[PDB]
Symmetry: C3
Subunit: 181 residues, 3 copies
Amino acid sequence: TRTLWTTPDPSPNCKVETARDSKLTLALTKCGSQILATVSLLVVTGKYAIISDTVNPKQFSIKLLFNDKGVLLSDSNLDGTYWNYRSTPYKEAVGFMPSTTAYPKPTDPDKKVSQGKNKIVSNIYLGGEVYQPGFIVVKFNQETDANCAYSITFDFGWGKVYKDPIPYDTSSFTFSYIAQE
Amino acid sequence: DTRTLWTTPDPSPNCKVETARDSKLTLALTKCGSQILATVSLLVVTGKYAIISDTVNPKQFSIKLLFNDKGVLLSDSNLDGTYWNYRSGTPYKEAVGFMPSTTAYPKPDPDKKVSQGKNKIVSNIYLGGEVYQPGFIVVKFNQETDANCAYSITFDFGWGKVYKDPIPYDTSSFTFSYIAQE
Amino acid sequence: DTRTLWTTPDPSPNCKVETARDSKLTLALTKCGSQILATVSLLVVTGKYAIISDTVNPKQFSIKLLFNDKGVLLSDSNLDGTYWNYRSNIGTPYKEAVGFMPSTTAYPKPTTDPDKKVSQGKNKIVSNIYLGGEVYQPGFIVVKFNQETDANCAYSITFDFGWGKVYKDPIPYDTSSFTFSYIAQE
Ligand SMILES: CO[C@]1(C(=O)O)C[C@H](OC(C)=O)[C@@H](NC(C)=O)[C@H]([C@H](O)[C@H](O)COC(C)=O)O1
Ligand SMILES: CO[C@]1(C(=O)O)C[C@H](OC(C)=O)[C@@H](NC(C)=O)[C@H]([C@H](O)[C@H](O)COC(C)=O)O1
Ligand SMILES: CO[C@]1(C(=O)O)C[C@H](OC(C)=O)[C@@H](NC(C)=O)[C@H]([C@H](O)[C@H](O)COC(C)=O)O1
């Protein structure tokens, strides 16, 4: 029942547009065959720090790329310095990776492969205000960058018209997925 | 318990939407003490709901998992029980620990009013995982009476948005939890 | 531990929206190491918010769970602690539940550098819920962590319930169940 996280109060640790322009808070907890996750994002500087209807595109991507031992690769948008188990860098986390059987890397109707199953899509709310919806898309194992064995990708965006600019500062989002091990 | 009861993570067609085995229901239930953590997704592979558009009616269908008092799946369920089993093909004998509580979610003076909302979980899912293709899911606990079931988990799937260009009914994954019987 | 803190299976009203015992809160918190897994639902049985429509204002109300530094529920909470205990002890109240409290590091109590900007969204979880569980009857829920200062609380979990859709025919404020998780204090 271990937890792999960014630490709960991270310094800027994540690239949206430029290095460390945002704070990703991400906690993964192993509940046997499923991982329970909570994620939130605050963009602190740059193009997406304060958004409005003039900003385009209205979506950006945060990639976590892992090798076959579940170690985060430096090509990830997330900086690995404080990505570790909750209390030395960790050696292995295959247990926390999204399953390549449930969520295979991209490649008879019984052989139709689902396009939806490897994604989780919901609204989040900017500043936690019910009248400031945006969206999150979590994707498992959809990346090919850096020859990753596994990947978790967060697409953040919005669609509602905001004429008065507001911080891109998401409510916390809970999700779960089938673990590799 | 941290045990998992599931369809297997990559099932063959295993579920009836319109006809038998016309879809692949991926469902994993993991026991976290007396709450179950669940993840569900649906891919309809053949028949009326494989490719939907505004001309298909009705725009909602029901998938019932019906259990006896040992938590064993009854064959009247929409889900085929052949590979519904604990993660580890001998069929399991007991899974009451994974059933929705009949105290928190009973089968159907202001102080004595009973909640109709609490046995349901309702949310959007997104076909193909695209933010512009919403559909919906309703998870219902213990609301079936079919086959003298002692427990039930029902998944209602549907959509409301107009889709003139047809799209596969291929849901994003949906997470939920519920109070376990024991 | 892997225990559960919940509203106990007594069927009486256990919560105050507007007046004492006008509502029935269902909440279960289950500890998964450093994360809490939760499910919450609310039925208002009497008073202003039992049956709602567009002529009811405001369209939001708040249910506060306030805890001391041992994780014990304070009597200033909207939830009547008569009905709040570990699931198992019927007459023995719990002494300690710090492990179920929302982290004050992840979710600090409210109080120049952009890099030191404090997230306003992170301590909230916001979603639709659906009245009666009907897909055409959306309402909303806002779960907030540690944002209260009432009663010198050490920790808090606040549920704001409301709705925005225009309703002509009155409908019971009877929410679908909502799952969420949060980072635990320890
Ligand atoms: C009017 O449209 C919206 C909006 O974009 O603002 C849609 C918005 O719903 C979504 C999914 O974006 C809704 N928010 C929630 C969490 O219910 C939101 C609220 O229901 C609404 O702002 C609440 O208003 C009142 C009267 O309390 O309404
Ligand atoms: C126009 O309304 C909709 C739609 O039917 O497409 C509603 C849709 O929201 C819902 C609850 O269906 C929304 N998707 C999400 C995940 O929020 C979706 C997104 O806001 C929109 O597609 C995103 O647009 C941009 C500019 O990225 O907008
Ligand atoms: C027309 O707008 C709405 C509504 O307010 O009723 C928006 C409503 O969505 C939201 C986010 O409120 C939607 N329900 C769901 C769960 O997606 C809902 C359903 O798609 C719609 O009611 C579907 O109709 C039936 C009965 O199948 O449509």
